[PDB]
Subunit: 252 residues, 4 copies
């Protein structure tokens, strides 16, 4: 089965992304103002995209993003059967990637707030794995940034993928996509890294629910958990229309 | 119409540059000493050039700069009819790019100085979109830096564009130009990023005039608004002569 | 003898890595909070891998890591006779690389704690050359990070090396491996850089034993010296199985 | 005359390097702890090498270093007549590059210490253009770092230049050399950037002598001015022998 082979590559690619990305977030959160700031988080997350794509690029195409996979299926470049397989493979591996980071920082995470696991607050460790609303980043405000961020990512991704343009040699597509991830985190109001990936958000968040943080990871922030899933899905559609209207429909 | 197709690519490319660039400036200005310093602003602006060129490079040549377009027209490498079309397309998209950043940070920008929009001062938000004079960066002083910065950018750009040299494969021209933008911001006295682009300056500045900042964005700094337009236009001419005299005229 | 030629390249490559890497660590440790933080250490160590690979890549394959060499021998891609030759060549050159750094900072190192050489503590200089346990990085905790870090490095390295994939042009393999080293240091809990290299650890540590620090460099931290040797050796085996099971065994 | 054409390219390349490099140093020195630290200085200097090489690479080979030119002449790869022409062309352009930086920061430099030009001290501006000894960086100590730094640069440069290896495509040689410059500044004890270039040191230093700083720029630091000239010249010879003995003499 060729589909199973691509799913395994997607799972390994997302495992590298989450483990390498959330590990840098853990160092910054646990070591308050000691191991750098948000620049290291975005640089590590951005460079993790390049490494993950270089590993699983030749096998599954290195989507590593349900929004990216949805965009290709919308453009009829991939079968619709790949959408559930890739999303399940991308979610399974972000769940596994968060487990490795939890094991690496098991002693430090439990000692952040004494001997208890707190979801949100000054002594909050659940923000290492999943994104949570800020003071000015409420549900209405946070929906717009994810829509814009995903649309920008889709437009840049489709530029290096369209067959009408000259083929891009291997070793530059990975860096280009990784450059977008680093730039998006720096620009948009999200200090967690790759906040436009539905698999990178729901995966680790589901792990924290069973790891000991409880069900409060889903019922906090006025039920914020579904926003980083629906919003990038709609942003990918908008990004496809923006690119097609400006560049895609005229490449004869 | 082929010209219309190139104009759309230029508008999209400048939209990516301004939205990704001014978004990082907004985070630094609004979060005073929290989301990094000037290194993040220059890195985000420099990497935004690479992404914008990689998107619109194959369609319009990825000028994204009225000074760069003027240099090509001066060297007779492009028709003079492209100068008004590209400048209008580059300005329209910097205006649109600033609107996206304004929408992203609408709540934070309005709360910077209470419930009012101030152009200049310690509680100033108009500096996110457009450049304003500093204490040692007056009209006479600020004219020289933009002249030198644009001349350096033109010389570097013409090195990778001249047909006499070996053709540069796609995926390295974008990074080379982006490297110049990051270096120029670090070297010259401008903490806003890409301060040598007439479209990146007048575009967002015009948006702030209608967004609510008033007409003071044009009548402040002893009428500074026209400097980041005239000065890079003259610097591009000087950069063309410097490159042609040293390298261009001898490439037989 | 072809084997002797490859050993000389490995010694020179590891000499460049340790001298360029440990030199940045010396500046940060000696200049407490003056010459940057851990970002510079990881960037210098990561970029040193790229330079070392670009130098000795065409002669010996640019392993520069006993764990990497062990992985190739395990996969039957290299003869088992190369394992002792490369390990000796990699250790000899990390010993020499630490000597250059010691000579460069001879006056500053001796004046860190007055006129004495201290192994561990606030006035500790032995941490420039070798890794030492932290408060939350004990022998049991530190074993797991090195196992995970080496496994991640092996998986990424094998992706660009497998002959079934398209050959990678020279000039991108060096940067890809250097990217992994920078990312691993940022993610895992190690503020020394390239903490998954057995030669980079035992080599400089052996130098400090004879340089004047005494035998305490081996008997401190509950005999921590053998951990950065055994743990990456086991992690390389795990990384080989992870890559082969997911990608390697299906590349037909 | 072909030799005159190469000299003009070398002058322009060194002009880009010094103006882009010393401009970042001026911002850090004048804005005490405001425009970043030593990371920006090394990043700007390192990236300036890449831009300068990409401009003058196809015309003169992009040496931009008297030590590098001396190494090629020693290896009989270039005629000995090129040594005085390139050194004069490299020095003329570092003198011109420092003049542009002086004009850019004329008001800020003169106001650093009131209304006077001081060579050394807390209110010292002569360190922007030329290197000066530190507390632990005396003449004997500073000689060794420049010898080691130049030898490391020569070894890395010769790796990508030797014809026996596979030719390096344009667009990667510039980045490789620029990577060495950034790494050397971070590793060795020099917070000025590219402290192993005789032209980058004597050129701007000579400008300060006539700009108003007086002859004290040559008679300070126990006559330190000749060290950054003799030491890299000897280091280039040592770097050539190190590379030839290990790799060069065995490439059959």
């Amino acid at each position: 089965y060729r589909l199973l082979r691509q799913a395994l590559a997607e799972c390994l690619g997302t495992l590298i992304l989450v483990m390498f990305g959330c590990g840098s977030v853990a160092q910054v959160v646990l070591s308050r103002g000691t191991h750098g700031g948000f620049l290291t988080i975005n640089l590590a997350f951005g460079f993790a995209v390049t490494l993950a794509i270089l590993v699983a690029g030749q096998v599954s195409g290195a989507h590593l993003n349900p929004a990216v996979t949805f965009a290709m299926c919308f453009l009829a470049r991939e079968p619709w059967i790949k959408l559930p397989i890739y999303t399940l493979a991308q979610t399974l591996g972000a769940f596994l990637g968060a487990g490795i980071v939890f094991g690496l920082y098991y002693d430090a995470i439990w000692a952040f707030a004494g001997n208890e696991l707190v979801v949100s607050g000054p002594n909050g460790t659940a923000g290492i794995f999943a994104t949570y609303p800020s003071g000015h980043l409420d549900m209405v405000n946070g929906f717009f940034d994810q829509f814009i961020g995903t649309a920008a990512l889709i437009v840049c991704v489709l530029a290096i993928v369209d067959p009408y343009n000259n083929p891009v040699p291997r070793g530059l597509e990975a860096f280009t996509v990784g450059l977008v991830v680093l730039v998006i985190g720096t620009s948009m109001g999200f200090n967690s890294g790759y906040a436009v990936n539905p698999a990178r958000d729901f995966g680790p968040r589901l792990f924290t629910a069973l790891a000991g943080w409880g069900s409060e990871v889903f019922t906090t922030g006025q039920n914020w958990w579904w926003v980083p899933i629906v919003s990038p899905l709609l942003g990918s559609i908008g990004g496809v229309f923006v690119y097609q209207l400006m560049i895609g429909c005229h490449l004869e």
